């Protein structure tokens, strides 16, 4: 029953069918936030999945049992989707959200709940989102790469502007219950990143569990795990016949997608938007 259209909530674009004024509004206003609750927030296609699998492996201290038997989307449910983690009985609760800070669960700000925000090179996010839209049922066709790029720069896509998203959420940097990390940092030193996240969550791991979290967190291990690779999804929601959720899993694929002209227009957009921002791994 997916149209591949957008509706708006507080001025932000949401895919029809998987979201509704109610589901979003409920996520925004719920008072149900707990001190040991864990949230993973990202702009779509930045590697949410990667992070979800890593923390599921950490919570079970390295035992692959849980990630092998339960679908990735049921282990870290979305807060705003029609079937939200808030609209369910299931602690320690692990949840996911793509909502931009000005819409995310307000009760969070005065709580002790933890949040890991993950950022990825917007260019690579563009490519991942481009391909994914073709096989994702809730998303309309990208159109030409060039038109898709313009849409992305205008924030005419699910969850709005990538620039607004990351800039808003970085406003939390400094609070001890907020960790900011990037796809590039995980690609560069997965183990190093896993230890760092263990510290953040107050969940130390022996050399054994650690090696195990790293092993089952690898792209190849994950693409190979049925419960984790989205292949149990209805073809009407994700066309398996035509593509995979876990597409390439690398850094830099944007250079094979952007024409030089597109790459130069993007840098102009980026330069204006990120004027006072700090330097990110992907800033070359
Ligand atoms: N373990 C892993 N290692 C590297 N990339 C991973 C990964 N798990 C997921 N990804 C990548 O994260 C993107 C999906 O993001 P999200 O989960 O936020 O929607 C995909 O990028 P690509 O399309 O570039 O391959 C996917 O391959
Ligand atoms: Na689609």
Swiss-Prot record:
Any coiled-coil regions, as ranges: none
Gene Ontology CC entries for this record: cytoplasm; cytosol; endoplasmic reticulum; extracellular exosome; intracellular membrane-bounded organelle; nucleus
Record's keyword annotation contains Disulfide bond: no
Record keywords: Cytoplasm, Disease variant, Endoplasmic reticulum, Ichthyosis, Lipid metabolism, Microsome, Nucleus, Phosphoprotein, Steroid metabolism, Transferase
Top class in the EC scheme: transferase
UniProt effect for mutating residue 122 to L: In ARCI14; uncertain significance
Reactions the enzyme catalyzes: an alcohol + 3'-phosphoadenylyl sulfate = an alkyl sulfate + adenosine 3',5'-bisphosphate + H(+); 3beta-hydroxyandrost-5-en-17-one + 3'-phosphoadenylyl sulfate = dehydroepiandrosterone 3-sulfate + adenosine 3',5'-bisphosphate + H(+); (24S)-hydroxycholesterol + 3'-phosphoadenylyl sulfate = (24S)-hydroxycholesterol 3-sulfate + adenosine 3',5'-bisphosphate + H(+); cholesterol + 3'-phosphoadenylyl sulfate = cholesterol sulfate + adenosine 3',5'-bisphosphate + H(+)
Catalytic residues as annotated in Swiss-Prot or TrEMBL: 98
Cell compartments where the protein resides: Cytoplasm, Cytosol; Microsome; Nucleus
Protein origin, superkingdom: Eukaryota
Listed EC numbers: 2.8.2.2
Binding site for 3'-phosphoadenylyl sulfate: 45-50, 120, 128, 183, 217-222, 247-249
Entry's Gene Ontology molecular function annotations: cholesterol binding; cholesterol sulfotransferase activity; nucleic acid binding; small molecule binding; steroid hormone binding; steroid sulfotransferase activity
Record-listed substrate binding positions: 73, 78, 98
Organs and tissues of expression: Expressed in the stratum granulosum-stratum corneum junction in the skin (at protein level). Expressed highly in placenta, prostate and trachea and lower expression in the small intestine and lung.
PTM statement from Swiss-Prot or TrEMBL: Phosphorylated.
Main location class: cytoplasm
Note on domains (UniProt): The C-terminus, which contains a proline/serine-rich region is involved in nuclear translocation and enzymatic thermostability.
Disease: Ichthyosis, congenital, autosomal recessive 14: A form of autosomal recessive congenital ichthyosis, a disorder of keratinization with abnormal differentiation and desquamation of the epidermis, resulting in abnormal skin scaling over the whole body. The main skin phenotypes are lamellar ichthyosis (LI) and non-bullous congenital ichthyosiform erythroderma (NCIE), although phenotypic overlap within the same patient or among patients from the same family can occur.
Described purpose of this protein according to its UniProt entry: Sulfotransferase that utilizes 3'-phospho-5'-adenylyl sulfate (PAPS) as sulfonate donor to catalyze the sulfate conjugation. Responsible for the sulfation of cholesterol. Catalyzes sulfation of the 3beta-hydroxyl groups of steroids, such as, pregnenolone and dehydroepiandrosterone (DHEA). Preferentially sulfonates cholesterol, while it also has significant activity with pregnenolone and DHEA. Plays a role in epidermal cholesterol metabolism and in the regulation of epidermal proliferation and differentiation.
Record family assignment: Belongs to the sulfotransferase 1 family.
Protein name: Sulfotransferase 2B1
Residues of the full protein shown: 26 to 311 of 365
């Amino acid at each position: 029953k997916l149209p591949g259209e957008y509706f708006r909530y507080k001025g932000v674009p949401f895919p029809v069918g998987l979201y509704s004024l109610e589901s979003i509004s409920l996520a925004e206003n719920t008072q149900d936030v707990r001190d040991d609750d864990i949230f993973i927030i990202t702009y779509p296609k930045s590697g949410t999945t990667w992070m979800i699998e890593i923390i599921c492996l950490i919570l079970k201290e390295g035992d692959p049992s849980w990630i092998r038997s339960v679908p990735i989307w049921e282990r870290a449910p979305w807060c705003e989707t029609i079937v939200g983690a808030f609209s369910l009985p299931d602690s320690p609760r692990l949840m996911s959200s793509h909502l931009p800070i000005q819409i995310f669960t307000k009760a969070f700000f005065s709580s002790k709940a933890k949040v890991i925000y993950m950022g990825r090179n917007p260019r690579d996010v563009v490519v991942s989102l481009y391909h994914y839209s073709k096989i994702a049922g809730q998303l309309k066709d990208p159109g030409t790469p060039d038109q898709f790029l313009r849409d992305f720069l205008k924030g005419e896509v699910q969850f709005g502007s990538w620039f607004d998203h990351i800039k808003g959420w970085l406003r939390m940097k400094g609070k001890d219950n907020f960790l900011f990390i990037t796809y590039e940092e995980l690609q560069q030193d997965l183990q190093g990143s896993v230890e760092r996240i263990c510290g953040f969550l107050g969940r130390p791991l022996g050399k054994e569990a650690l090696g195990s979290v790293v092993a089952h967190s690898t792209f190849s291990a994950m693409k190979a795990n049925t419960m984790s690779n989205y292949t149990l999804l209805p073809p009407s929601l994700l066309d398996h016949r035509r593509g995979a959720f876990l597409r390439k899993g690398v850094c830099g694929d944007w250079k094979n997608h952007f024409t030089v002209a597109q790459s130069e227009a993007f840098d102009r957009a980026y330069r204006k938007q990120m004027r006072g921002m700090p330097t990110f791994p992907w800033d070359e």
